[PDB]
């Protein structure tokens, strides 16, 4: 009866929450309290990009840390080249909405998507001296909010159908769905071997999943309310979440639960970007009160600020050999941090 | 200084910064808006009528460019997005005005259009957005007012201490207990929109049947109003 | 985790109290509601704030039903009187983000929201 596997349900999930409190012999705070306090980290801006006409909502860093491509809501890609804050590259989108973008490893490549419900790719090295869109992929019922480049022919779509999916790019079907959110899946992070990846939704809850057996492998919660950005630790046994309900939060793959949660009283705006320094002692958190928070992951304190936009940082990304980072807001401005 | 493939490349940058200059007086000088309804309302008809008269299978926006008076106009409608809102409606935050389509003439999904009404007026980021609400459909309400087998009062009482504005202007020639219910949901939506307006946006009423020719007229003047008041306060006038 | 287990025949003219136990979020910051839905989608019919101070009501449920909440002890309750033939099943629905004055609380399985619980009234 449904009543039957209603009960089922609550079985194990009460089976699930007692075996996670049983494993949680200690706070990660009281393990990390013996720890310096990474101290005040004044970061500075080196170059401001300026070109964008309307607010940013994606940037993704080059592997080579120098190039960066950034997606903007007036129909814009820019290729900057940030040690001379030359643009290299000028993509004007098919759809103006566009609320994601990644830059393929390889350097031949880039992707955008938004509200088109579309992930197209872009072909950034061609014999003809432009840039061409290279394909379009379509199939998801709800809007594109990330997408991240797995090599040149396999990408990864979180949509707000409650789907992450993985697609063929050279044969634009789909290859394998991942199906269990009830929420809009807003983040996604992929993992650094790129076997595994994970997606935080509009329920609260994220997981990670398998790239090859294209099923849901583990879940987590936590949070109070809808979240936003998600990324790996470097190590690739845990991810810190940034939610709606003004906290940061570090789950462990291994372990199954919560680690730290990243919270001030006197913070009570939306995290809309999250990601980590090379190290993972600095978890980097940009807010909707139009400044980016750097956190001090081991032991949540607020290490800095970086205070400069004059609106809400909507994306922050940092580069592969930790030199920089770099924010990019509502304010039509990215500005790179050193 | 610096080598000759440098110079090359900050020429190339220069040109790019030219066309972005380009671009920016076409984005400048044209309009955005967003256009909301139900099932019920008749926004399709709408969006329909403005394509005509004025200038792909799960794709999740649509778009309509048109303009009044050599102006130019984007109206976006969503298409294929699920019933969730709350995240694909942030980022609408700097449209000129929201175009919000209501039918008038159901009586039963009226108070969910008020409540959807009520969270885009009250969005921390839709704030600083006029909201142009088209009070639809109002043949519809018509005839069935007249024919009285339904009661307004049922699902709304405070319909019976309810009595016309001063202000009211009937211009056909209309059944005063037409005139009476149409100005009373369109105080309804009034006044959720001057319950926190604050001031910084602006509410403008209009009753519409679909068949309308003059939509496009109305958005524009609301739009130069809007775009004036901007003005008004970025050039220090207030 | 977020839970909203909502707890509460009646005959016509009766009265029933429908409580709602919160548990995993801070209760007290969110602005609370209520959902029904007959055998028909689903309605809005009462919400409340942080505070308890705002209060608003659908017109078919004005003087009738009475939305009120204890944020000390984590509950959205109303105590329904004179249920005319109302017959539905009740949800106890949370405002998608905390602080806002703006809800977007949907038949495409909004995630917070309880199981629900049915309300007949029938002689």
């Known amino acids: 009866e449904l009543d039957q596997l209603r009960q089922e349900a609550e079985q194990l999930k009460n089976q699930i929450r007692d075996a996670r409190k049983a494993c949680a012999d200690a706070t990660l705070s009281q393990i990390t309290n013996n720890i310096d306090p990474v101290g005040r980290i004044q970061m500075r801006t080196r170059r401001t990009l300026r070109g964008h006409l309307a607010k940013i909502y994606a940037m993704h860093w080059g592997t080579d840390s120098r190039l960066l491509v950034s997606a903007s809501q007036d129909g814009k890609l820019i290729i900057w080249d940030s040690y001379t804050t030359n643009k290299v590259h000028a993509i004007p989108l098919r759809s103006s909405w566009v609320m994601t973008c990644a830059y393929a490893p390889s350097g031949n490549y880039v992707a955008c998507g938004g509200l088109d419900n579309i992930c197209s790719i872009y072909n950034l090295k061609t014999r003809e001296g432009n840039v061409r869109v290279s394909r379009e992929l379509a199939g998801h019922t709800g809007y594109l909010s990330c997408c991240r480049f797995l090599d040149d022919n396999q990408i990864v779509t979180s949509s707000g159908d409650t789907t992450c999916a993985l697609w063929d790019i050279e044969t634009g079907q789909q290859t394998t769905t991942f199906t269990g959110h009830t929420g809009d899946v807003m983040s996604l992070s992929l993992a650094p071997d790129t076997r595994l990846f994970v997606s935080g939704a509009c329920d609260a809850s994220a997981k990670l999943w398998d790239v090859r057996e294209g099923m849901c492998r583990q879940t987590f919660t936590g949070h109070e309310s809808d979240i936003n950005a998600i990324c790996f630790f470097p190590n690739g046994n845990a991810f810190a979440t940034g939610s709606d309900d003004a906290t940061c939060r570090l789950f462990d793959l291994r372990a199954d639960q919560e680690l730290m949660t990243y919270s001030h009283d006197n913070i009570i705006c939306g995290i809309t970007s999250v990601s980590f320094s090379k190290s993972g002692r600095l978890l980097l958190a940009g807010y909707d009160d139009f400044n980016c928070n750097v956190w001090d992951a081991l032991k949540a304190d607020r290490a800095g600020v970086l205070a400069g936009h004059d609106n809400r940082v909507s994306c922050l990304g940092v580069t592969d050999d930790g030199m920089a980072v770099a924010t990019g807001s509502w304010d039509s401005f990215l500005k790179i941090w050193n | 200084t610096l080598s000759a493939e440098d110079k090359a490349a900050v020429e190339r940058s220069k040109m790019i910064e030219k066309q972005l200059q380009k671009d920016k007086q076409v984005y400048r000088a044209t309009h955005r808006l967003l256009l909301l309804g139900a099932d019920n309302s008749g926004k399709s008809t709408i969006v329909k009528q403005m394509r005509i008269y004025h200038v792909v299978k799960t794709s999740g926006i649509f778009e309509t460019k048109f303009q009044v008076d050599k102006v130019n106009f984007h109206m976006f409608d969503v298409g294929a997005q699920r019933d969730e809102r709350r995240k694909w409606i942030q980022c609408f935050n700097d449209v000129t005005a929201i175009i919000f389509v209501v039918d008038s003439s159901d009586y039963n999904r009226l108070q969910e259009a008020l409540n959807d009404f009520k969270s885009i007026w009250n969005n921390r980021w839709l704030r600083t957005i006029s909201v142009i609400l088209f009070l639809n459909k109002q043949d519809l309400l018509a005839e069935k007012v007249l024919a009285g087998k339904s009661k307004i009062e049922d699902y709304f009482p405070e319909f019976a201490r309810y009595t016309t504005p001063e202000d009211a202007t009937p211009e056909p020639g209309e059944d005063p207990r037409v005139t009476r219910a149409k100005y009373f949901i369109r105080d309804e939506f009034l006044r959720i929109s001057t319950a926190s307006g604050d001031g910084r946006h602006y509410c403008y009423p209009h009753f519409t049947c679909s068949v309308d020719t003059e939509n496009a007229r109305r958005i524009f003047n609301d739009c130069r109003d809007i775009i004036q008041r901007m003005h008004l306060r970025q050039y220090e006038l207030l | 985790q977020v839970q909203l287990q909502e707890s509460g025949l009646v005959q016509p003219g009766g009265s029933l109290r429908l409580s709602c136990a919160a548990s995993?979020?801070?209760?007290?910051?969110?602005?609370m509601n209520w959902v029904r839905q007959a055998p028909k989608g689903l309605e809005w019919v009462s919400d409340?704030?942080?505070?308890?101070?705002?209060?608003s009501y659908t017109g078919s449920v004005k003087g009738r039903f009475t939305i009120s909440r204890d944020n000390a002890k984590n509950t959205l309750y109303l105590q329904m009187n004179s249920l005319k033939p109302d017959t539905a099943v009740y949800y106890c629905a949370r405002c998608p983000a905390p602080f806002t004055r703006d809800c977007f609380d949907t038949s495409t399985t909004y995630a917070y929201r309880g199981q629900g619980t049915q309300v007949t009234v029938s002689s």
């Open positions: 995993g979020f801070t209760f007290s910051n969110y602005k």
């Open positions: 409340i704030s942080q505070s308890g101070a705002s209060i």
